[PDB]
Design a protein around this ligand. Structure first.
Ligand code: ADP
Ligand code: ADP
Ligand code: ADP
Ligand code: MG
Ligand code: MG
Ligand code: MG
Lengths: 485, 467, 466
């Protein structure tokens, strides 16, 4: 029976050349003698090239290969929340079986033109520099790009932690379910990542999909698509989900290995011709649906690691052209004290103020150009500058200091507006730059403990009221003079 | 004639025919599929076998599956019944509005119009955008290309060109979505419904849509640009009327070709591209032209990979264009929109005997002071503003005011700049820059010229900065 | 049962079997060889022919020579009676002290510990070294990596770290010489005999040695890392006792993998490397880890090809680490030792919640002024330090003093310097840099901070120059 079963001709480097399987489909899942799964990616006239989902010591010449008659699928639903799973959706946290009542295909194509609607809901990260200058909306694709140890993962983590405020509330369309996809990382890092989310009480709405460094290349290759289908469930059921691919750099590496050992010719940096289509078809699946389809969304945060800042490399240039915006991180700024290390000039968001609350739009609207005027004069300055150009330098330096932020303390949007207000209105222009960070800490905690009614009104009204503008001014000016002494 | 699949490797599918073998470029129908799957014959491998590229995903394909030869290349619906409708690569409606009711179809592969069919007629058309109108004007029935790296404003620019030029046009427009964002497809569709250019109940629709975004496989992206221009070829030839064609993005045509090139059995060329890069673009672009039968005004957004203009894809595209609009990241970073490089954009109709000696001299005058300012920028970077002569800082202040006056608010960019967009006439554009070059506004502040319409708005803004 | 050689090139040898084919990773024994020649099965080529990779020189092999399946993968001696002994790739003793009679054996290939086996414990390991403890401190049971190009001091650093930690660590230690200098192995062996951490007369030996140096063919160098790894694995699990694993140099694993990949008929990856680079490293590195069962504090020296940190070999290694120590050539050429780059060395425990708010702030202060100094470097070289402002001149003088106070005399470098080895406590390291940052030693000369122990010696050195 060579129509439904096959025989292994050769096996090496995760690739099995199989004779037979005459009725096997392209991209179909096949089972080996030892129980190991394999995906049929090459259909040649005399053989079938099968990529192996595990070790190949358990596969020998002459082994029997069997059809399952299906493409790859993964478990789906709210039963995955709080769980750590592998690429196929098998639980690896040891906390029991996933009691999921639904399955979903991993290779389902993106929604077309019709089922979509304009991005109109804010996806708050809690990071001042993001929510103000690179605002993300629900259903958007926003890249996190930069060298190693620039803070990429930490942007994604703080974004996840920030959602607790929405998920503990009663408002349901305000909620966001998180999916962290780890690709090619080590297991100890992943466990330390889960420990961090558990302490912040963030796990209860987070799915962790992990295909680590010891896992086979096909496992690493499939992991992003598996987690995407998990997000798509929320998207198609009137709910909002956030996915994080950390990172698509290591996924491309895994796919290259497969493609090279299937004897597909190499291109730029040894990558296959379809490496762009690999990520494009993935990130296109992130969308904001119209109300007839549920009004749910899927926001994607892909991560790309560059080498020595080389943004010109094959892989990074692909993902930049795909996404609706990028957040650029640099080591130079990181060690200069600018943490998060967001290069504001290079970073953009195509959705823009349409992804901001009416309050944040009022304060951040001016910041963009005001900082652009600053960077122009920054590499333009001790030959002594005139009063006008020294003012532009002063303002820019003081706004930059406000964009600084520590870790694991994601800020509410009303608290963000208040601290941006003080800088953008010039109330800190004649303050020594070294104490702006010190100012923000003491100023905010005073507004938190003694002025809840102000923050509460900015939160609920969604904008800066004329009465709120007067009250903010009243606090900042009197706090100023006390702090200055 | 019935054939059988023998090989499936990604987008590349090999099919065997025991009898009559189908010629290259034919459309083959795969049997036993839920959605219509088209394989376009690319090569004759020999031994009664053809090599094809798939127009959709190749998942679920079996060796030995029936494949039928349609007898002709991919054929799509043409005519006034494409107006207000969105089509894909193979001519299927994707707007959920039903079948395209017509007994008139055309093959997406065709011979490029001959040399005798070319028209030398060049006439300037007003666009409303100052930088373009002044420095690098577009011509009626000309070939316009908007260059730029990632995030510089290619889409925003082409969007407002449809918002302005289609108004000054009584004919039909075609928009080809080639390998870009499906999100922007939803954006453009609903914006045109709002603006009334697409009408879902009557026949007043004036824009035909063709889409094949970056979720589609390479084959689909490689031919969806030809599907777009074949609709444009009908309105031009079979009617004899003026047509407008917009493409975002035509780089994706070349990208898609390189994505399959390895699997077609080609040795890679320079910078990882296909050897066929130039001729593929040739037999495509040479169809995008004005003839003696009719006129096509074409606007093509062109991606510049890692904003490197030497890259073979964008570098080979320059020779196909009459007007080039080159966008710059450094100019976008300053906050100047559109981010058009004034010293890297050409027009060809830039000639004293075409646009006028008054127009031409202002354009060169604006370019001269900005080029001279660039050399002055090299001094104030190290020594500072205090070192410049009184003559020097006079030209700097004028050059900086001219930089900002080149920028204007777009009517499709309300969320980005804050205030509404506005259209500026050509005669007011020449006069405006002419006045600044003479030094008539050396008393006005610098930010008075930033993001305004005509020169009259700059005067009014100067009063508003005081109190 | 019996096989026949059909193809030989370099370390890659093809064997054909009539009946019963050996599974991938099986050790094969070549007949007719005076010394033991182990072929490890890597690929099933089809037609009853396997593709293998040798563990020693393949010279003197003939087409038709007989090969026998061992039945298992390469198995080496493991257990307490390996301590004080030196062994090669296939676990054969190379110290001329006789057979290693162990009660247990273990295959050099094993699957990496599952996700449930992972421990989240992060506790500081004080090295006594200023650059390390201050900026990027190592963790107990964590993974440590020492990056560097040719001659910047990877080996000198790992040897000082052995001397500083292994004495104060009441447990067993494992050293794996991978593709490095053989005379270094001789120096380490006899030094350990001299000190007493390795004993030939007694079973008090605390260190096990495994060696496959740059004189071995690629097959040996590609696998020798697993042999030393398997010894370390046993001590972690089937005892509970804490283990130190030192590897010099782990790059040789990946380099040797590149040599054989060219002969296995693979299509090369970028930079000519193997397409399986990241997954080969992945299945190997994930075995070097702390579990809930036992703890492994691993230190790995990592070579950097042509000083390029973007090279696929060092670049892929970063994600397998918990603390990085990157060495720079320019910092080495200035006379700074250890040549640690303060702005490219990282640690996951560099966090106010873990090391303290005072420790963290000083570390970030040291880094800020060094990045500020690095920015001015161009204008300093064109014009001069005298053309700087009063604000900039003050940061430059302090940063230059911080640079030098980061350097330290090592106990292993007691001949290379002629000076005394210095071991500095953490509290005194924090205090030292804190004072320079606040401006307490602005009057003191630069060279006073060069190559000293604690902050007190910087003052005492300045007194002699008065
Ligand atoms: N806003 C911040 N403030 C202080 N430290 C930060 C901040 N963001 C990141 N870090 C630190 O930087 C280090 C690297 O962060 P990580 O997100 O792991 O970088 P990447 O993901 O780019 O490798 C971490 O040790 C983290 O503690
Ligand atoms: N005319 C404009 N006015 C203001 N901002 C603009 C304008 N054009 C582009 N931008 C900015 O650049 C971003 C990218 O625009 P887009 O057209 O998507 O660039 P590209 O198509 O070249 O990738 C926008 O989201 C916007 O922030
Ligand atoms: N901490 C140090 N103190 C003094 N000299 C050093 C130090 N580190 C390296 N060196 C010098 O550099 C040389 C090479 O060191 P080594 O560790 O062998 O480099 P690598 O192992 O990176 O090739 C040594 O011979 C020594 O003279
Ligand atoms: Mg990370
Ligand atoms: Mg675009
Ligand atoms: Mg060494």
């Amino acid at each position: 029976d060579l129509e439904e079963t096959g025989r292994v001709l050769s096996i090496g480097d995760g690739i099995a050349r199989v004779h037979g399987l005459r009725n096997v489909q392209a991209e179909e899942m096949v089972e080996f003698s030892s129980g190991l799964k394999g995906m049929s990616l090459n259909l040649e006239p005399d053989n079938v090239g099968v990529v192996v989902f595990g070790n190949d010591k358990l596969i020998k010449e002459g082994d029997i290969v069997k059809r399952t008659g299906a493409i790859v699928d993964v478990p789906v639903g709210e039963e995955l929340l709080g769980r750590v799973v592998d690429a196929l959706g098998n639980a690896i946290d040891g906390k029991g079986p996933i009691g999921s009542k639904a399955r979903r295909r991993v290779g389902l194509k993106a929604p077309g033109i019709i089922p979509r609607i304009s991005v109109r809901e804010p996806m708050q990260t809690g990071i001042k520099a993001v929510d103000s200058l690179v605002p993300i909306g629900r259903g958007q694709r926003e890249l996190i790009i930069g060298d190693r140890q620039t803070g990429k993962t930490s942007i994604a983590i703080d974004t996840i932690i920030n959602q607790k405020r929405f998920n503990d509330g009663t408002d349901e369309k305000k909620k966001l379910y998180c999916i962290y996809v780890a690709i090619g990382q080590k297991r100890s890092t992943v466990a330390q990542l889960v420990k961090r989310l558990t302490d912040a009480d963030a796990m209860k709405y987070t799915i962790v999909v992990s295909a680590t460094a010891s896992d086979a290349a096909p496992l690493q290759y499939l992991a992003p698509y598996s987690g995407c289908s998990m997000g798509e469930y929320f998207r198609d059921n009137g709910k909002h989900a956030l996915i994080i691919y950390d990172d698509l750099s290591k996924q491309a590496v895994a796919y290259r290995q497969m493609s090279l050992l299937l004897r597909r010719p190499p291109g730029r940096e040894a990558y296959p011709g379809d490496v762009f289509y690999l990520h494009s078809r993935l990130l296109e699946r992130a969308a904001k649906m119209n109300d007839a389809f549920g009004g749910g969304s899927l926001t994607a945060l892909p991560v790309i690691e560059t080498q020595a800042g080389d943004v010109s490399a094959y892989i990074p240039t692909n993902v930049i052209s795909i996404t609706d915006g990028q957040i650029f991180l640099e080591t130079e700024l990181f060690y200069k004290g600018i943490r998060p290390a967001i290069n504001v000039g290079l970073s953009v968001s195509r959705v823009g103020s349409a992804a901001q609350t009416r309050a944040m739009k009022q304060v951040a609207g001016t910041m963009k150009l005001e900082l652009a005027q600053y960077r122009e004069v920054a590499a333009f300055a001790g030959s002594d500058l005139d009063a006008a150009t020294q003012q532009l330098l002063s303002r820019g330096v003081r706004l930059t200091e406000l964009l600084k932020q520590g870790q694991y303390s994601p800020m509410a949007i009303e608290e963000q507006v208040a601290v941006i207000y003080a800088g953008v209105r010039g109330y800190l222009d004649k303050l020594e730059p070294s104490k702006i960070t010190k100012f923000e800490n003491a100023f905010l905690s005073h507004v938190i403990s003694q002025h809840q009614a102000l923050l509460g009104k900015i939160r609920t009204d969604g904008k800066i009221s004329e009465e709120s503008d007067a009250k903010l001014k009243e606090i900042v000016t009197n706090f100023l003079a006390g702090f200055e002494a | 004639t019935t054939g059988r699949i023998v090989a499936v490797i990604g987008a590349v599918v090999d099919v065997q025919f025991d009898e009559g073998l189908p010629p290259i470029l034919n459309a083959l129908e795969v049997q036993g599929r839920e959605t219509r799957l088209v394989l376009e014959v690319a090569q004759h491998l020999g031994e009664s076998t053809v090599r094809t590229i798939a127009m959709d995903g190749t998942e679920g394909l079996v060796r030995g599956q029936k494949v039928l030869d349609s007898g002709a290349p991919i054929r799509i619906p043409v005519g006034p019944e494409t107006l207000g409708r969105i089509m894909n690569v193979i001519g299927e409606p994707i707007d959920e509005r039903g079948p395209i009711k017509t007994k008139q179809f055309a093959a997406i592969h065709a011979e490029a119009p001959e040399f005798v069919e070319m028209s030398v007629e060049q006439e300037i058309l007003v666009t409303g955008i100052k930088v373009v109108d002044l420095l690098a004007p577009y011509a009626k029935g000309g070939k316009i290309g908007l260059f730029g790296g990632a995030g510089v404003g290619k889409t925003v620019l082409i969007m407002e060109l449809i918002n302005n030029v289609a108004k000054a046009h009584g004919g039909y427009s075609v928009f080809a979505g080639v390998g870009e964002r499906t999100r922007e497809g939803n954006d453009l569709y609903h914006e045109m419904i709002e603006s009334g250019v697409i009408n879902l109940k009557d026949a007043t629709s004036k824009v035909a849509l063709v889409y094949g975004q970056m979720n589609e496989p390479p084959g689909a992206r490689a031919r969806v640009a030809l599907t777009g221009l074949t609709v444009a070829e009908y309105f031009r030839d079979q009617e004899g009327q003026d047509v407008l064609l917009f493409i975002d993005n035509i780089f994706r045509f070349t990208q898609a070709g390189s994505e399959v090139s390895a699997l077609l059995g080609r040795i890679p060329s320079a910078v990882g591209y296909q050897p066929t890069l130039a001729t593929d673009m040739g037999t495509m672009q040479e169809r995008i032209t004005t003839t003696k039968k009719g006129s096509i005004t074409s606007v093509q957004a062109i991606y510049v990979p890692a904003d490197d203009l030497t890259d073979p894809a964008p570098a080979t595209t320059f020779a196909h264009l009459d007007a080039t609009t080159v966008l710059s990241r450094a100019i976008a970073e300053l906050g100047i929109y559109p981010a058009v490089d004034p010293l890297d954009s050409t027009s060809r109709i830039m000639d004293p005997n075409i646009v006028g000696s008054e127009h031409y001299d202002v354009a060169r005058g604006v370019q001269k002071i900005l080029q001279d300012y660039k050399s002055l920028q090299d001094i104030i970077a190290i020594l500072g503003m205090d070192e410049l002569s009184e003559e020097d800082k006079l030209t700097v202040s004028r050059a900086r005011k001219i930089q900002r006056f080149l920028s204007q608010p777009f009517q499709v960019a309300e969320v980005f700049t804050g205030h509404l967009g506005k259209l500026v006439p050509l005669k007011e554009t020449i006069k405006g820059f002419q006045q600044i070059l003479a030094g008539e506004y050396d008393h006005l502040p610098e930010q008075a010229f930033y993001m305004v319409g005509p020169i009259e708005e700059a005067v009014a803004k100067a009063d508003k900065l005081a109190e």
